[PDB]
Amino acid sequence: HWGYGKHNGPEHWHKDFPIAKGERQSPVDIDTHTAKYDPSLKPLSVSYDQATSLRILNNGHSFQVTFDDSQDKAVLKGGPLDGTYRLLQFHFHWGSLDGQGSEHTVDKKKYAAELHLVHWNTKYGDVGKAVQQPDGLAVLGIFLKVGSAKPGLQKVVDVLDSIKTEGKSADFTNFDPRGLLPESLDYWTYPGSLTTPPLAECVTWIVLKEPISVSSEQVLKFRKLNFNGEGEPEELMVDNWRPAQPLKNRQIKASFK
Ligand SMILES: [Zn+2]
């Protein structure tokens, strides 16, 4: 039932998911001048060399690339995290125009898109259990700005025509998520939530300071996706982003000076 439209979008979500008005909702505006540098934060450990991608799916709200998370093959550790978090999937949020599309904002600036790499804490054994825990998930967020192409994104771009409408999926093996990462792993971190229903308050957010650049042609391909199933009226999958939510007694910490 939920979506991103006038009648089912973010301002409606609290009726089905009352935690939408909770104390640790995401995304937020990152006020860079208010974030405190924390010299106790470790460098983030991103160990993606043995990642095994499986499939790409249009889920009606975004598209997602799924990984084999049955072993410790692609894991996030360190930074603000205690323990080991397995990569489950990545997906994106994007706009109808290049000046909107990100969920997090940086001093109110919106990027054209935002990549989310979703990981779950192995101490909970499975993602469904993990979303019921306050430290269940770690989502690595990466901003996309429009300029030069990101060569590592092209394999994703090129298969989107095969998953246009909701419910379509394809095999998507040997995709290397290292090709989506910026140079620097400098980050902001704070405790928050899933940014889509069920909006569970289970996420340690790790948002990288450095955006990746993608080309206009790459982002245009995202915007050709459809929210609708084949057979329903065509509605472009654009503006699939939740706006910034109240910070409410949280501190955002910076890994860098
Ligand atoms: Zn997301």
Side-chain angles (χ1 to χ4, degrees), residues 91 93 103 116 195:
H91 64 272
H93 304 267
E103 296 206 309
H116 291 163
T195 68

Side-chain angles (χ1 to χ4, degrees), residues 52-57 64-69 87-90 170 172-173:
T52 300
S53 66
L54 293 170
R55 303 272 300 171
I56 192 170
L57 165 66
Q64 68 169 299
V65 174
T66 60
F67 291 79
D68 175 11
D69 62 344
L87 177 66
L88 170 65
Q89 57 101 295
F90 68 78
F172 199 69
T173 59

Side-chain angles (χ1 to χ4, degrees), residues 165 228-234:
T165 47
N228 53 284
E230 188 172 342
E232 310 172 351
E234 176 160 19

Side-chain angles (χ1 to χ4, degrees), residues 1-41 43-128 130-154 156-210:
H1 174 72
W2 72 269
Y4 292 95
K6 174 71 150 168
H7 301 284
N8 66 355
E11 307 309 315
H12 294 268
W13 295 347
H14 72 99
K15 292 179 271 169
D16 271 345
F17 307 94
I19 205 173
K21 294 181 181 277
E23 299 302 301
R24 56 172 284 184
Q25 289 288 292
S26 294
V28 299
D29 182 55
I30 299 166
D31 191 81
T32 67
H33 288 293
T34 295
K36 208 191 181 182
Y37 167 57
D38 184 349
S40 75
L41 282 169
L44 187 68
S45 175
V46 183
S47 298
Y48 289 172
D49 57 300
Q50 291 302 308
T52 300
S53 66
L54 293 170
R55 303 272 300 171
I56 192 170
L57 165 66
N58 180 329
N59 65 29
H61 315 286
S62 182
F63 72 90
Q64 68 169 299
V65 174
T66 60
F67 291 79
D68 175 11
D69 62 344
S70 71
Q71 291 190 84
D72 289 2
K73 282 178 170 190
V75 303
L76 191 63
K77 306 170 48 58
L81 307 168
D82 286 332
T84 295
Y85 290 68
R86 285 189 191 157
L87 177 66
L88 170 65
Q89 57 101 295
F90 68 78
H91 64 272
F92 300 79
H93 304 267
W94 65 87
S96 50
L97 305 168
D98 296 349
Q100 64 198 49
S102 67
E103 296 206 309
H104 295 88
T105 54
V106 178
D107 297 333
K108 304 293 176 96
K109 178 183 171 65
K110 295 173 168 70
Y111 289 88
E114 189 173 326
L115 165 59
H116 291 163
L117 296 121
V118 179
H119 312 76
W120 57 268
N121 194 328
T122 60
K123 83 186 191 189
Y124 305 124
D126 70 75
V127 71
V131 297
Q132 301 173 248
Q133 314 304 328
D135 60 347
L137 276 53
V139 184
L140 180 60
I142 300 176
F143 298 119
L144 280 59
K145 66 180 181 182
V146 175
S148 292
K150 192 64 168 168
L153 182 60
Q154 195 61 30
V156 170
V157 166
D158 284 333
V159 298
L160 297 178
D161 74 292
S162 76
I163 60 156
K164 186 179 175 178
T165 47
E166 181 182 0
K168 295 195 87 74
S169 63
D171 293 299
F172 199 69
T173 59
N174 302 101
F175 182 78
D176 189 341
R178 296 177 288 186
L180 297 176
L181 306 178
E183 288 178 8
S184 179
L185 293 178
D186 289 349
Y187 66 86
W188 298 287
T189 184
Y190 75 96
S193 76
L194 309 174
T195 68
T196 55
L199 304 171
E201 290 181 337
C202 62
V203 180
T204 300
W205 276 95
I206 301 166
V207 178
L208 297 191
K209 176 195 45 161
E210 183 184 331

